[PDB]
Write a protein that binds this ligand. Sequence first.
Ligand SMILES: NC(=O)N1CCc2cc(Cl)ccc21
Ligand code: NA
Lengths: 252, 10
Amino acid sequence: ENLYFQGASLTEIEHLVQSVCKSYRETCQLRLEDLLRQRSNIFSREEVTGYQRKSMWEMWERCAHHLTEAIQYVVEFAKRLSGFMELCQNDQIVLLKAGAMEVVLVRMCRAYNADNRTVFFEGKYGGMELFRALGCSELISSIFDFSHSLSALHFSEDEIALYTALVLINAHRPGLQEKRKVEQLQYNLELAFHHHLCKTHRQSILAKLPPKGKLRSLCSQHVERLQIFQHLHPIVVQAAFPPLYKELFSGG
Amino acid sequence: KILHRLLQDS
Ligand SMILES: NC(=O)N1CCc2cc(Cl)ccc21
Ligand code: NA
């Protein structure tokens, strides 16, 4: 079904590095050059106050829409990833349901300015205080800390491409029917990532990558906070949250 | 419903 479902040669691994990097470059929601250029564009005290005065429901709605927009780009990244479209539909959905948010959390570090602890949001950079109306301070703080930690690694765009391919192609996700096929694709993407690091003298980052369970903890906290919000504003979720967001995080 | 549509949309 795909070359990468079996043992790949060095030259095939080299091709895989190029294919993954190309898939990522074509499916960025935000260009790195744009994010870096916009760093001087920061929300004023007045603008921050405006976001803080928004109702909890209006802020949750906006943030769910922005997350859904990011997730759509991750779905396109998946579709372009060597071997992904050759997996069965059940496995494609299992991997995206479990991994789409994890990939967005990783992609976020590009939009995060470690210099002043701000993130690009609705056209300007703002600190975590911009999100205070959500009423999930702990989760926002944890996501900022995560982006801060990833920012300290100074990832290149190619490293992000290969690392996020692996975040998505995880053979341990519960529910995978063709687990052996996913294990082999994961093995080849792992080789592609480690080969690129070896070639660029960046193998030192391997021991510095987030631990096993860190991305899972942030994803579980998101679902928990959404369930709290849903109990408070059930019709906001039913009437005004994006259908894709609900399919991923509230079981439809 | 959505994920199936996005995956099927070529
Ligand atoms: N850029 C963007 O859409 N972001 C950055 C930070 C952030 C937090 C939440 Cl809750 C939703 C979206 C976003
Ligand atoms: Na960053």
